[PDB]
Structure 1
């Protein structure tokens, strides 16, 4: 989760993650690009408001009051500079002075040309294989972060796409209470709460940015999958996109797609939740996918209908008490899928986003693995498109996004876990075309 220059013995002991940009008087002389006007090292702002009583384990989990259990000093970048050491630009800006505006367009995957489809599939496959140039992931919790001898930081390199999988896993993992004890599972820093939409928004933004530099294509953008067609089948599960069903194993991906070659990370819950370790960069089995195949559960055998999307966009309040998976008339809870498209809660309901996940009946529909299936990317750009249309329609009204008593991780000023540098839900609660440098080529049913 941290820049590789902060994943050292020195940086962790200091509590400071303020790396140099280009120092030309020695180390520590250009922290946060302070010798240019680009930024400065300063104290971390973290949320201290109370959370819901559902989490009773304050003091036990490194994700609490993120990121204070690892660092209390961060770079704050000046103006429209951005990045861990202020060496890049805020979303929507480019240039050495971050003063040239950019606006990329996220399009329906099915509307792209034959060349554009092939370029997207190989970019994803490239990101699955290419080491992340900036971030390394911890394989142990903080008390064991410096290794057995106390001088070996327990971080591993990880590919650009597996880092995308890993941050999601880390945001949903159970609180480890100790060997012999049962891990606590009624906690989720990115789902079942107001932060669901802003968390996944930043999640996509980080991956899109990483792939832009990996490809050195500033205009590269992530497409979306319109899953609200009411269809019986996954219309993007073809061998020119995301892969069709294997004729030799109906739960595997066609060998004529590169995605049949992918191997998943974070599939050892037995180990993590009993020995206290974290998901590491070692890959395991293949992606399992079986669209419409959950015969035991007929309600998740068909995708949402077009009118489901139109109805959830009529929900005018972003979220409602108790800001959880049982909220009624909450746009966030409706599009997440715990309530029906009108906002009516029913514990037996699976709609929209949750239904699209369960429709896959496989890796993409399992809470600890879902980003391993690259359909996750397209499922959530569409979910983000619905969010962006809501932001336009209701003038980005953040007033119902609670400042306190949300599920832990979901207060408005919580730093979304485990993103670095620290970024709050508020910073994502903005209309994308004017504030984040992207827009959706899409039209809404009516």
Structure 2
């Protein structure tokens, strides 16, 4: 989750993650591109405000007041610069001066030409096989991060797409208990609470940027899946897109799709929750997908209706107390899918984003594994298009987004876990076209 440069004994010892940009005069002489004016090494801001109660709750979780368990100094960039060392630009800008506005367009995957479709799944496949040039992922919790001999950082290289999967797993994993310790309350830094929409927003942005980097195609954009069709099939589960059903195993992907070759990460909950370890970069086993195949829950075998999208955009409050999966008249809880499309919570309703996950009846539905099915990307670009439309209709009314007593990870000014450099929910609560340099090509149901 940290730059390779910072995953060292010395940098953890200093508490400082401020890598050089262009260290012409030797190591440490252009931290954060300070010698060119691009940024400065400064103290991290981290939300201190209180969260909703948990019984029991030790507070030993390395995700509290993120990222303070590891670093308390990052790069703060000036102007429209950013990046872990301020070597790149804020979203929406390009150039060595970061002064050319760029605007990329995210579109319906089904609206793409045959050429762009092939470019997408090949780009996706590439990002699955290519080492992240920048981030490395911890395989051990903080108290063991430096190894048995105390001089060996427990960090692994990981692929671009697997990093996208890893960050999501880390945000939802259970707090370790240990030996003799009671069952700690279950927590979720990226779902069941207001930060769900902004966490996943940044999640996508980080993948888009990493893939534009990988391809050296600055305008590359992630497309989206309109799952609000009422359909009983998955209309992008074809061999020229996300993969059709295997004729040999009806829960596998057709061997004629590259995605049948993908192998998953983070599928060892039993190992982690007992050995005390974290998901690592070693893959094991294929994607399972079985659209409309959940015969035990008939509600989970059709997709959301088109009016479900239009109706949830009528919920005027962004979120409501207790800012959880049981909130009512909360647009966040509606689009996430624990309340019905009108606003009304019911513990039996599964709608919209949650409905779309369960529909797949496979790897795409398990909360710790779901990004391993690449349909995740396009399910979430769609979800984010709904978020972006809400932000527009209601001028980004951030007021009902709680500053405190939200579930842990979800306070308005929390640094979304485990993204780097630190980045608060507030920074994602903006219309995308003007403030984040992307927009959606989408028409909304007009009822």
Q: Per-residue displacement from partner, 1:406-436 (whole Å, max 9, x unpaired)?
A: 0000000000000000000000000000000
Q: Per-residue displacement from partner, 1:186-209 (whole Å, max 9, x unpaired)?
A: 200000000000000000000000
**Could you tell me which residue of structure 2 aligns to residue 127 of structure 1?**
127
Return the alpha-carbon distance in structure 2 between the equivalents of residues 221 and 262 of structure 1. Answer: 22
* Deviation for aligned residue 1:309: 0.2
8 Å contact from structure 1 (residues 91, 437) kept in 2: yes
* Deviation for aligned residue 1:162: 0.1
Return the alpha-carbon distance in structure 2 between the equivalents of residues 416 and 73 of structure 1. Answer: 17
8 Å contact from structure 2 (residues 57, 185) kept in 1: no
8 Å contact from structure 1 (residues 55, 187) kept in 2: no
8 Å contact from structure 1 (residues 58, 64) kept in 2: no
Compared CA separation, residues 350 and 310, structure 1 to 2 (3 A): same
User: Could you say what secondary structure the match of 1:356 adopts?
Assistant: helix
8 Å contact from structure 2 (residues 49, 403) kept in 1: yes
* Deviation for aligned residue 1:275: 1.1
* Deviation for aligned residue 1:178: 1.2
8 Å contact from structure 2 (residues 56, 184) kept in 1: no
Return the alpha-carbon distance in structure 1 between the equivalents of residues 360 and 320 of structure 2. Answer: 29
**Structure 2: which 5+ residue stretches go unaligned?**
none
8 Å contact from structure 2 (residues 54, 185) kept in 1: no
After the TM superposition, which segments of 4 or more aligned residues of structure 1 sit over 3 Å from their partners? 179-185
**Could you tell me which residue of structure 1 aligns to residue 441 of structure 2?**
441
Return the alpha-carbon distance in structure 2 between the equivalents of residues 205 and 333 of structure 1. Answer: 22
User: Could you say what secondary structure the match of 1:202 adopts?
Assistant: helix
Return the alpha-carbon distance in structure 2 between the equivalents of residues 48 and 337 of structure 1. Answer: 29
Q: Per-residue displacement from partner, 1:335-371 (whole Å, max 9, x unpaired)?
A: 0000000010000110000000000000001111000
Return the alpha-carbon distance in structure 2 between the equivalents of residues 300 and 179 of structure 1. Answer: 38
- Higher alpha-carbon deviation: 162-171 or 182-191: 182-191
User: Could you say what secondary structure the match of 2:273 adopts?
Assistant: helix
Q: Per-residue displacement from partner, 1:54-113 (whole Å, max 9, x unpaired)?
A: 364243100000000000101000000000001110000010010011000000000000
Return the alpha-carbon distance in structure 2 between the equivalents of residues 109 and 184 of structure 1. Answer: 42
* Deviation for aligned residue 1:23: 1.3
8 Å contact from structure 1 (residues 176, 183) kept in 2: no
**Could you tell me which residue of structure 2 aligns to residue 106 of structure 1?**
106
Return the alpha-carbon distance in structure 2 between the equivalents of residues 202 and 185 of structure 1. Answer: 26
Q: Per-residue displacement from partner, 1:209-240 (whole Å, max 9, x unpaired)?
A: 00001000000000000000000000000000
Return the alpha-carbon distance in structure 1 between the equivalents of residues 399 and 105 of structure 2. Answer: 29
* Deviation for aligned residue 1:119: 0.4
8 Å contact from structure 2 (residues 371, 377) kept in 1: yes
**Could you tell me which residue of structure 1 aligns to residue 401 of structure 2?**
401
- Higher alpha-carbon deviation: 224-233 or 22-31: 22-31
8 Å contact from structure 1 (residues 230, 302) kept in 2: yes
Q: How many residues align?
A: 446
8 Å contact from structure 2 (residues 55, 185) kept in 1: no
8 Å contact from structure 1 (residues 174, 183) kept in 2: no
8 Å contact from structure 2 (residues 32, 76) kept in 1: yes
* Deviation for aligned residue 1:180: 5.5
Compared CA separation, residues 382 and 306, structure 1 to 2 (3 A): same
TM-score for the superposition, normalised by structure 2: 0.99
Aligned CA-pair RMSD = 0.8
8 Å contact from structure 2 (residues 265, 283) kept in 1: yes
TM-score for the superposition, normalised by structure 1: 0.99
Q: Per-residue displacement from partner, 1:285-323 (whole Å, max 9, x unpaired)?
A: 000000000000000000000000000000000000000
Return the alpha-carbon distance in structure 2 between the equivalents of residues 179 and 116 of structure 1. Answer: 53
8 Å contact from structure 1 (residues 188, 409) kept in 2: yes
Q: Per-residue displacement from partner, 1:23-44 (whole Å, max 9, x unpaired)?
A: 1221111111110110000111
Compared CA separation, residues 55 and 170, structure 1 to 2 (3 A): farther
**Could you tell me which residue of structure 1 aligns to residue 19 of structure 2?**
19
8 Å contact from structure 2 (residues 47, 65) kept in 1: yes
